[PDB]
Design a protein around this ligand. Structure first.
Ligand code: NA
Ligand code: NA
Ligand code: NA
Ligand code: NA
Lengths: 211, 211
């Protein structure tokens, strides 16, 4: 959840918002170790429920998200249902555990490609065009993350947009991401420079991946 | 419907057969003028029912077809349901009226392209990949006709097969077609030559389109 003023500004300037619970357990092995554990349901529930209680009157919020990169656990299904019960006015999405689980109203993959399949075990990233028409599939597809804008990037961006326009159920996506997470440091002369992972003695670190 | 021996040979050698009623009203304006007319329902009904009565014991027949290029009329809906009622063992298909009407269990377009839409009024030929995922659509897609093999042709054949293999619900198609409909004529020296439309004084004719 963002600073409260953000939603007011999106209400007034006009931007659609996906409001996302503060739940990410990416470093767990497997990713759902905590989110499938009923002992972590209370802690998870508060992060979802208290977000909905705070932000549910904002018109800019059109979609609720259960968090990010926490695999798919039974706690997700429980909280998906809780939101649907308490607020039927907004779709609920969640990418974890393969982007098309029982915990999402929208097929919402991250970095699924336009034409090329990436058939990873358990959590494949299908071609978005192919994903739509998998047997029994009916949901819209909106990428929660696509077109990773790291350094000299956005090659093939036009390919996404051609597909979005041609396919009714391909309804766009969210670019990753808006702003480089660089920090200012100062050299011997007091001149500022842009710093990334490792520049503060932080170790282990992931270097320029924050930008 | 074919010569009766054809089905016996397909049974024994092993080919899947689409058995198709002898109904085509292509030259009507609009194409469904007769097939939407209840006064022509009896004549159409005999062409469908007598085919099913004759061929229903052949294992090679896996799909019934209501005919070809006769638009979409209420008579098609009635006869679709008749077959479904008398023989639940086989799907019923029909391409007329846009390839995805209420008279077909299979999206069965003719000459729909792999990636390129052809948005004709009333009866568009969507890209086959796009067609599968149109809002609400769930049926398999098998082209009743594709890859028109007229003269020096079959350019782009590989593109169809790549799509067939990638998309579960793209389950192939029927090439148009097997054998040139040329006829033998004899010159002044008695030597045979292959003849096409117009070579018999037939007029109007469609020249080499029979090959
Ligand atoms: Na679209
Ligand atoms: Na990053
Ligand atoms: Na297929
Ligand atoms: Na022809």
């Amino acid at each position: 959840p963002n600073h409260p003023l953000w939603y007011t500004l999106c209400d007034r300037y006009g931007l659609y918002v996906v409001d996302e619970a503060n739940i990410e357990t990416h470093g767990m092995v497997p990713m759902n170790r905590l989110t499938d554990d009923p002992r972590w349901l209370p802690a998870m529930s508060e992060r979802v429920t208290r977000m909905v209680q705070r932000d549910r009157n904002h018109p800019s919020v059109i979609i609720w998200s259960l968090g990010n990169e926490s695999g798919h656990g039974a706690n997700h299904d429980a909280l998906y249902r809780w939101i649907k019960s308490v607020d039927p006015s907004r779709p609920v999405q969640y990418e974890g555990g393969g982007a098309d689980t029982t915990a999402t109203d929208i097929i919402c993959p991250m970095y699924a490609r336009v034409d090329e399949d990436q058939p990873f075990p358990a959590v494949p990233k299908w071609s978005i065009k192919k994903w739509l028409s998998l047997p029994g599939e009916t949901r819209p597809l909106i990428l929660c993350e696509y077109a990773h804008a790291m350094g000299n990037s956005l090659g093939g961006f036009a390919k996404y947009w051609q597909a979005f326009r041609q396919y009714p159920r391909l309804q766009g996506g969210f670019v990753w991401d808006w702003v480089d997470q660089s920090l200012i440091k100062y050299d011997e002369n007091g001149n500022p420079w842009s710093a990334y992972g490792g520049d503060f003695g932080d170790t282990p670190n992931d270097r320029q991946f924050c930008m």
